[PDB]
Amino acid sequence: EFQRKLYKELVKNYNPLERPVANDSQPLTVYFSLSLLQIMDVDEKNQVLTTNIWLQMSWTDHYLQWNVSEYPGVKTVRFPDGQIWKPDILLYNSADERFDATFHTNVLVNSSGHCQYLPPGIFKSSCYIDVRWFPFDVQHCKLKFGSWSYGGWSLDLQMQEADISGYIPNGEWDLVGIPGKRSERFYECCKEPYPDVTFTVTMRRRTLYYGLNLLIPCVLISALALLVFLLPADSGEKISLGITVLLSLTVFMLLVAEIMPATSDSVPLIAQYFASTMIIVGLSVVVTVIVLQYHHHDPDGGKMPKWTRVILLNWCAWFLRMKCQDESEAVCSEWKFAACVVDRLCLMAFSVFTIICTIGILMSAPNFVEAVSKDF
Amino acid sequence: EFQRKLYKELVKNYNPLERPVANDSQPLTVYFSLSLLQIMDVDEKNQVLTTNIWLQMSWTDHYLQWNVSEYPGVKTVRFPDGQIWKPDILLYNSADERFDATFHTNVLVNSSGHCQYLPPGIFKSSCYIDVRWFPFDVQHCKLKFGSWSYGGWSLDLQMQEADISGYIPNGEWDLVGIPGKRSERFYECCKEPYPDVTFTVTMRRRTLYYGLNLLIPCVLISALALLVFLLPADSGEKISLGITVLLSLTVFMLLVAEIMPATSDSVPLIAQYFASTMIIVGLSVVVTVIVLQYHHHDPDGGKMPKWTRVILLNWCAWFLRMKRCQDESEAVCSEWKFAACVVDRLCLMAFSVFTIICTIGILMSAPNFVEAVSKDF
Amino acid sequence: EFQRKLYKELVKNYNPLERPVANDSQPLTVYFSLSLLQIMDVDEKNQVLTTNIWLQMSWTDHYLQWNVSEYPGVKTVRFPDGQIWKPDILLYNSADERFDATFHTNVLVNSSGHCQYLPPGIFKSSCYIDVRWFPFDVQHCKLKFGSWSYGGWSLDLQMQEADISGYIPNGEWDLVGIPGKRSERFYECCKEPYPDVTFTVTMRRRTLYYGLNLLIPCVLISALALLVFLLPADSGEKISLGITVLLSLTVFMLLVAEIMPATSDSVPLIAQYFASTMIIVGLSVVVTVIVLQYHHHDPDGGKMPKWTRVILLNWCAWFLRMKFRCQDESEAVCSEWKFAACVVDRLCLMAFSVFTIICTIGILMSAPNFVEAVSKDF
Amino acid sequence: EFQRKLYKELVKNYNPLERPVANDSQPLTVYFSLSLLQIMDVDEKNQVLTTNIWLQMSWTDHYLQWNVSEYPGVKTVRFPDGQIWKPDILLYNSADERFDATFHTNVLVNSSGHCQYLPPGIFKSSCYIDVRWFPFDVQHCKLKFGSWSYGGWSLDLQMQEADISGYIPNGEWDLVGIPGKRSERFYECCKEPYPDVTFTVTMRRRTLYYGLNLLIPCVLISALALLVFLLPADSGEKISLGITVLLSLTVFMLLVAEIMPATSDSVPLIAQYFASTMIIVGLSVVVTVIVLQYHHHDPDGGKMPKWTRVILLNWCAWFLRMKFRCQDESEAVCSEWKFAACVVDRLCLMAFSVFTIICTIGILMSAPNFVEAVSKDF
Amino acid sequence: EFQRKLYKELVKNYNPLERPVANDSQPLTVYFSLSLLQIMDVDEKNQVLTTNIWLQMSWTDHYLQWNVSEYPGVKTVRFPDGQIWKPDILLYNSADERFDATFHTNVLVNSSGHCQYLPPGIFKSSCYIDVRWFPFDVQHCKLKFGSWSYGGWSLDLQMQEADISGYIPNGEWDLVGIPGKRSERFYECCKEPYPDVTFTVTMRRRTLYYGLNLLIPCVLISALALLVFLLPADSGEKISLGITVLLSLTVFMLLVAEIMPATSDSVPLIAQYFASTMIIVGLSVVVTVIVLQYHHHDPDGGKMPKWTRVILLNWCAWFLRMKRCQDESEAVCSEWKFAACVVDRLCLMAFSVFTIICTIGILMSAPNFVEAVSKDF
Ligand SMILES: *[C@@H]1O[C@H](CO)[C@@H](O[C@@H]2O[C@H](CO)[C@@H](O)[C@H](O)[C@H]2NC(C)=O)[C@H](O)[C@H]1NC(C)=O
Numbered sequence A: 001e002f003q004r005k006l007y008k009e010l011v012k013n014y015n016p017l018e019r020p021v022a023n024d025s026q027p028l029t030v031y032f033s034l035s036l037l038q039i040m041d042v043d044e045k046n047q048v049l050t051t052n053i054w055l056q057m058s059w060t061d062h063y064l065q066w067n068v069s070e071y072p073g074v075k076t077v078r079f080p081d082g083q084i085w086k087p088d089i090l091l092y093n094s095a096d097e098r099f100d101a102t103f104h105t106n107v108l109v110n111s112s113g114h115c116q117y118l119p120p121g122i123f124k125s126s127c128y129i130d131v132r133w134f135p136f137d138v139q140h141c142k143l144k145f146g147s148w149s150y151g152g153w154s155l156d157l158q159m160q161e162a163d164i165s166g167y168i169p170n171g172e173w174d175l176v177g178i179p180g181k182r183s184e185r186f187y188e189c190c191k192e193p194y195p196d197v198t199f200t201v202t203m204r205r206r207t208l209y210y211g212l213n214l215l216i217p218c219v220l221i222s223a224l225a226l227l228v229f230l231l232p233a234d235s236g237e238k239i240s241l242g243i244t245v246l247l248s249l250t251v252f253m254l255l256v257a258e259i260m261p262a263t264s265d266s267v268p269l270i271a272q273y274f275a276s277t278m279i280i281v282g283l284s285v286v287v288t289v290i291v292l293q294y295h296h297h298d299p300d301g302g303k304m305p306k307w308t309r310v311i312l313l314n315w316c317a318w319f320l321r322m323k324c325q326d327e328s329e330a331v332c333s334e335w336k337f338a339a340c341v342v343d344r345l346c347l348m349a350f351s352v353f354t355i356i357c358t359i360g361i362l363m364s365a366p367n368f369v370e371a372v373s374k375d376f
Numbered sequence B, E: 001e002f003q004r005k006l007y008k009e010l011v012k013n014y015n016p017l018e019r020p021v022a023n024d025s026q027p028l029t030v031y032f033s034l035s036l037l038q039i040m041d042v043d044e045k046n047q048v049l050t051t052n053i054w055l056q057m058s059w060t061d062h063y064l065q066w067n068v069s070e071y072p073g074v075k076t077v078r079f080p081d082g083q084i085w086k087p088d089i090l091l092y093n094s095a096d097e098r099f100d101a102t103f104h105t106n107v108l109v110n111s112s113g114h115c116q117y118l119p120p121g122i123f124k125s126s127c128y129i130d131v132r133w134f135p136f137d138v139q140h141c142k143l144k145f146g147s148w149s150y151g152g153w154s155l156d157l158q159m160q161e162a163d164i165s166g167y168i169p170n171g172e173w174d175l176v177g178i179p180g181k182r183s184e185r186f187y188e189c190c191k192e193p194y195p196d197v198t199f200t201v202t203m204r205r206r207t208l209y210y211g212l213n214l215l216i217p218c219v220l221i222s223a224l225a226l227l228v229f230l231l232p233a234d235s236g237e238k239i240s241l242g243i244t245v246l247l248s249l250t251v252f253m254l255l256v257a258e259i260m261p262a263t264s265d266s267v268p269l270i271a272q273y274f275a276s277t278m279i280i281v282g283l284s285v286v287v288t289v290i291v292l293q294y295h296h297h298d299p300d301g302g303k304m305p306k307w308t309r310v311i312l313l314n315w316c317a318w319f320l321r322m323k324r325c326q327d328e329s330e331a332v333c334s335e336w337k338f339a340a341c342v343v344d345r346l347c348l349m350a351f352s353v354f355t356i357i358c359t360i361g362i363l364m365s366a367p368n369f370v371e372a373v374s375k376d377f
Numbered sequence C, D: 001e002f003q004r005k006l007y008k009e010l011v012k013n014y015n016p017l018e019r020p021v022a023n024d025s026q027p028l029t030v031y032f033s034l035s036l037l038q039i040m041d042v043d044e045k046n047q048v049l050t051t052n053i054w055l056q057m058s059w060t061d062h063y064l065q066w067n068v069s070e071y072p073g074v075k076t077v078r079f080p081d082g083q084i085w086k087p088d089i090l091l092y093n094s095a096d097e098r099f100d101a102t103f104h105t106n107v108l109v110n111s112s113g114h115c116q117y118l119p120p121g122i123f124k125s126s127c128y129i130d131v132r133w134f135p136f137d138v139q140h141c142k143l144k145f146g147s148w149s150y151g152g153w154s155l156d157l158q159m160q161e162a163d164i165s166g167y168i169p170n171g172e173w174d175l176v177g178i179p180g181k182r183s184e185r186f187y188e189c190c191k192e193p194y195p196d197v198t199f200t201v202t203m204r205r206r207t208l209y210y211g212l213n214l215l216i217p218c219v220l221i222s223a224l225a226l227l228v229f230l231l232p233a234d235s236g237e238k239i240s241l242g243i244t245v246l247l248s249l250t251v252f253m254l255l256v257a258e259i260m261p262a263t264s265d266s267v268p269l270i271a272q273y274f275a276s277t278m279i280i281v282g283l284s285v286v287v288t289v290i291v292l293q294y295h296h297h298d299p300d301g302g303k304m305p306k307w308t309r310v311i312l313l314n315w316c317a318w319f320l321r322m323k324f325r326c327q328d329e330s331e332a333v334c335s336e337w338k339f340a341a342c343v344v345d346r347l348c349l350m351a352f353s354v355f356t357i358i359c360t361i362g363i364l365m366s367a368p369n370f371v372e373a374v375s376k377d378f
């Protein structure tokens, strides 16, 4: 009864186009915030952020005010889309094909006129993904909200603190905070300024997944390449093993390309690590070819260079604690012994290069210590 | 004739925004329940569940009532979307881009006023998929339903037991049940509490499919890797079998990556088993290098360390029941080759024992393993 | 002049909510059928069927009746969606995200009130795909249609024979028929019964494409695997060829997995055949290591067990028609070992050849529709 | 001042359902045509064609007529969807999920009543893609247009010659023409005839892209397969090279599988080329194993059959212009056996070179459109 | 108060179909422009350009004029889609499935009637992507805008300079400018001419990403292929190394195929470079077979043709500074291996030079190479 009567009275002469102020000259205060429920996906290749968001827009309709003593029990009303004035707060940097992914729901008003509007939505935002440090990367993705067609003299946008009470963790991202800021900006279209609210979603990538799936396997497959320097040359599989492992590491670079965006702002840390390891494996291929040339040397070819006969069979040989047809066998054994010395020297040197480059590149990430401590 | 008169009478002064109650102060009892017709696809990369649900919302419209003695033969009327007050019971954890996968259908009513509204839809829900024990894992997926803008004082939501009579099996998931629960929660937006009905769809993965596409194949490829220890070394193909088989085993991890989500909450059992297999095969390659180093040992090189000369050619050799300058060099080479043969067999047995243990000990660490294997096969 | 008058006259007091009967108590007969124009795709992985369908729903509106003598030349009228009552017959087992893929068009009524409504649509239906017999599979995909909110006491649904005259073939699927059936089922929501019309689209997969792109290439590549027993061991490439072929046959399994659903209701025939082929090639590599192990046996090692010396160098040798001094003796003992290694190649050449022939033939002819397949599409 | 009055005047008693004819009995002449702007993609796997089309429907509304002397300066008016009667001309064989991809725009009327309506749209049409001759194929894709609910007695559809002046080239397809035809067919639903206008888009695939991406690389990888007969046997990599190149060729059959539809109407030409190439390389591996069997032949076994000793070491050896004591005698027999490996290598090198040449030319020039193709695209 | 009065007054007799001019005979000037905020995606395979655009359409409504002295504080009004006449300026060369990706927003009018309309949108346009010079390529994508149904005699379209102040860089594309041009074209449909405004978005591709993912790795993998000529033949892995690296170079051609459109207008520079690389590696395999044929020459076979005995063992050998029956047989076999080694060394220089030329020569055959190398590295 009273609900029917009140609904009939509240729509007499009501125009959903009129801004609901008592004094037309004064701006209308709109309190804006959001509740972030989940970060569903961050597809870095297209530079878009998908979030489950409950935007919270509250304002006051001067006309939707009733005296509850005259409408007993009726303390709130609800109006669907198109029947009540609403703030046209859009996401400026939207990436959704429709550009406005908000789902239009009811506006709950009470007896005093305070309007509460809590549209749910899946919002896609064009976020610049700083991939410099991936997988140890921290992203600051902005969600910029503002009235599309109302300036400061008409819609006085005000900020309320973001809600994360109902947030459900993701698995891949540690929300470090959603600090917000209210700005008063001027635009090259118009003279009246337009205020905006920008929420900076700060998220730290949890590195266990990519860590176990890319870094640890890469390290140990690069380690399978370093076994070539312990394999004997007579096996006739040095080049096979070495080249096969190198061409196997290409799969990791392919996967990164499937994940990463095609941006030239910087070179990804994962990319530098894959590049450094794979170039070192290629150098292992070059050096084993040299070992095989020393090993398979025609005895009646060139003589042993004195430089080599001392730099390998005297110094390096001692450092590592190694130590007519039959004269040629001695000669070839000497050439084969030189091949053995090169194997051990480069084994040690390439082992250290692997150790340094791996540790040196990974600790250049600011977030490395935080990462290893929180995620392992 | 009477249908026209009824439809004309029932819309007079009707407002689709007025809760259809007689006493405004009392909440309106709405009964809610769903019907899971099919689980078409549970997405595990985007942590999204997909279902073919037919919701059920029954209430009582105080305004849409008539005396059948006046309107012969019109015992029921139907109203489309936007003409009758309808409960705004949305899914809270929706993953659909429109957020509302409900298809708006008619609202049947009878001569007493009891509305009945069953909307169909392909509901997508953001469900946390516990992948810790995958493929032997019970996902527990919540579908939380509630009126978006009505609190407890206005819409008294009540739960009815879920219907699964028409449920159509899936093939991949054995529905273990869909228990529901009614909650009264408070929100940081508002003071009036809001009740919600949450249906937890509990799903058991049928493991035969993965069983034969990934795990048993991986076991057999790992045995194929294990064959390197039976190859004679003179073939010159030990390392090519080892490394080639390892590279073939990498596709299984690629597949599991293509299915799994990029989550750090846990390490899937499939991942731990695949990783242990990869580590065992890589260690087989390292040991392959060691055996080839012993086999190709220069006769005029280092001497056999007594620790080796006993630990390999005396104890391990007996346990397994094995037993001129060029001739002496061949004799040393012949010894070293015996050491190469002994290492192959010891590591054959040892890697055989680690394969059976690791596989059984990782797979039988899943609580649902027995239920699964006993029923899925 | 008269079409305008008729259109104005027919909407006087008309309500698109009223079911158009003269006697409210009697149900309204609705004749339901469809014209199947094309089966666009059957994505078996998702268990969905995409079809081009022109549902044919005809009924009688009591109120849309005029006397053509008073409206000369105006013999039919047309009304768009939302202006006249039309039966809300949906596809119950729909798999489309919107759940209702029907495209709403006009309703052609004539002077006697008979309404004809033939909406086109791209329909996705959740069809259980029996993948046991793939590629030689026959599917029975159900399209279940019924009025959502009208029971038998209100809308007397009647079936008309399915139309396939204008059906345009697909390329992969042989429509075996679209037999229909009217059923009266009870539901756990309600007491009034609900009738439905179920069209079972029966489809035979045309086997030439997959059979050329999966089955035959596996046969020939697996035959290449069994050929290792003609390669000599001294080549030093038996293991390379054998393992390379086995690892190459895995890509077919990747494609088969990319196509098929993730179901445990039964094991597909394509998979049992590939698995049986794959294990035979794997066993061939197992035999390969044994051949190279008997060959590369230390001449001064263990002696040939008499049991081996007979099973290989005496009996099997006849059936298949085969037939410094320390170094010479060492070559001699090694020489019998090489021949023993050679006999295993030939025995296992014959034996594994038979396994593939039996395995392949015995698994393929266990499909009921196999003879139809080879006879119709080859 | 006058545009407001005209718009106010023209909507008095106007009903957008009424066909705008003066005599209801006479059909309404509608002139239909289209402007083809671009062929964005034809995804043959799903058998659908994506085109940018601006359909051109022009007719005469009897009611939207004004005298320009009374409304000076107001010479044309525009009406959006739902306010003016429009022809419901749909694409019968549509493959779009919505089934109607036309974008609804204004209807430009002038003072004489002639309505001009040019809705743009991206149209998906279910087109039969003849993949028999691919990549040297020509397609005939139908765009079938007709009034959905108006027959010949009410809407007399008429064809106008299609416009391609503004056509934007594609890159992959040479528009050979869009000849149209008006047909009047009877349907199994209804008695009143229905006219339709069918545009057969004739498209020739430009073969430079696939000819360099698939044909030439396959030729060259098959040439590396033929190189096995020039490798010495002692290298121990003949089988490695041959099998490696075969598994390299497998990706091309994967690529066509990703491109081509899974239809069994025929075997695509590219598939027939790849199949013949793979068979030739596999047979080359077979012969490679036979040569290795001859090369690694023990000299204590069987003696060389006379047939072999002539067919290889006498005739074929002459035509192609090649030409401790126990160890030497065995080396002589081993040397004789190794010579046989060289003869087979050389004979089969020439023979497998020729069958690649024949197979290549005989399959490529079996397409009628091949010569025109190579002449236009290379 | 005054806002509601003004809204009531402005909608009396207003028709959103009427073009809002005082004199019907004179065309209505509409100023058109756009603000390009981002180039979201260039999927060249579909020949489509995805951009974030805020089209700017400004005109004057003759009827939406009020005196602010009579409506104090009410200086602007806003009207949603369907309530006021708007210019139907569409993107002619649209590739979006709905064909109109504009998001309909309010039209901000002031007291003098000037209407300001700035709709946002994700715009897909069918743009011819000249892949001739890829990755060092510059694209000129046209966005053609015009009123669909209003010709020059009714809607006098005028262009305003494009806004890029708020443009946010992309990462892969350097916006070189968006020059516009206003045209008056005649169409085969109609007699009244129709003006359009065409914005040519000019984009220079950033080459660091592709430079480091495909060009440099291809060079280094082809160099790895060139190592075959330093490998000794007795290793028995020349053919293995060469052929394996060639199948590895095929992934790059597959990647380019995944990227590039299916166009025959020209051959992309990347494709020509990869093709030359593949020909060099394949010719290296062919000559590798020849050297192995030289090395595995039966000593009792043919004799060395004098041509060979000079061109390899005298000139080329000196240029590169190289220098009983079984004894004779090994001696002749020793020369064949020496001939085999000489061919390897010549091929090392020659194929190195071919590698040097093709790589350097083909890459600077792109006009934009210097611009790229200077800006992108
Ligand atoms: C209508 O709702 C508004 C907002 O929820 C109420 O205003 C709040 O009242 C509480 C009670 O003292 C204050 O603590 C808040 O600061 C107020 N907020 C605002 C924005 O005004 C208002 O009281 C409600 N009206 C009635 C009649 O209860």
Ligand SMILES: *[C@@H]1O[C@H](CO)[C@@H](O[C@@H]2O[C@H](CO)[C@@H](O)[C@H](O)[C@H]2NC(C)=O)[C@H](O)[C@H]1NC(C)=O
Binding pocket: C110, C111, C112, C113, C114
């Ligand atoms: C209106 O259309 C209906 C259906 O097309 C017509 O009913 C059919 O008429 C034919 C002609 O004799 C009969 O053979 C069929 O059996 C009728 N069908 C049914 C279901 O009764 C009807 O005659 C048409 N009315 C007019 C005035 O032409």
Ligand SMILES: *[C@@H]1O[C@H](CO)[C@@H](O[C@@H]2O[C@H](CO)[C@@H](O)[C@H](O)[C@H]2NC(C)=O)[C@H](O)[C@H]1NC(C)=O
Binding pocket: E110, E111, E112, E113, E114
């Ligand atoms: C309504 O807005 C228009 C444009 O925003 C105003 O016209 C501009 O006025 C300024 C100041 O005189 C000039 O510099 C511009 O050149 C004008 N632009 C155009 C397109 O004419 C107009 O003055 C505003 N109306 C009122 C009442 O202030």
Ligand SMILES: COc1cc(OC)c(NC(=O)Nc2cc(C)on2)cc1Cl
Binding pocket: A212, A213, A214, A217, A251, A252, B250, B253, B254, B257, B267, B271, B272, B275, B276, B278
């Ligand atoms: C391509 O090659 C690989 C790819 C991989 O995934 C993307 C992984 N992944 C992996 O090792 N994941 C693990 C290990 C453990 C323990 O837990 N997760 C490995 C290889 Cl080799």
Ligand SMILES: COc1cc(OC)c(NC(=O)Nc2cc(C)on2)cc1Cl
Binding pocket: B212, B213, B214, B217, B218, B251, C250, C251, C253, C254, C257, C267, C268, C271, C272, C275, C276, C278
């Ligand atoms: C890549 O390598 C494999 C991949 C596989 O799928 C993902 C399978 N799958 C498999 O064998 N599936 C079967 C077997 C039987 C019987 O039924 N289904 C095997 C390998 Cl080796």
Ligand SMILES: COc1cc(OC)c(NC(=O)Nc2cc(C)on2)cc1Cl
Binding pocket: C212, C213, C214, C217, C251, C252, D250, D253, D254, D257, D267, D268, D271, D272, D274, D275, D276, D278
């Ligand atoms: C992975 O390896 C293959 C894959 C293939 O496709 C998926 C095919 N396909 C094929 O042979 N298709 C043919 C042959 C003829 C004649 O016609 N179509 C072959 C191989 Cl080897």
Ligand SMILES: Clc1ccc([C@H]2C[C@@H]3CC[C@H]2N3)cn1
Binding pocket: D105, D106, D107, D108, D116, D117, D118, D119, E147, E148, E149, E187, E189, E190, E194
């Ligand atoms: Cl009603 C009508 C009349 C004309 C047009 C056309 C004229 C120009 C070119 C395409 C479009 N704009 C489109 N619609």
Ligand SMILES: [Ca+2]
Binding pocket: A041, A042, A043, A044, B262
């Ligand atoms: Ca991500």
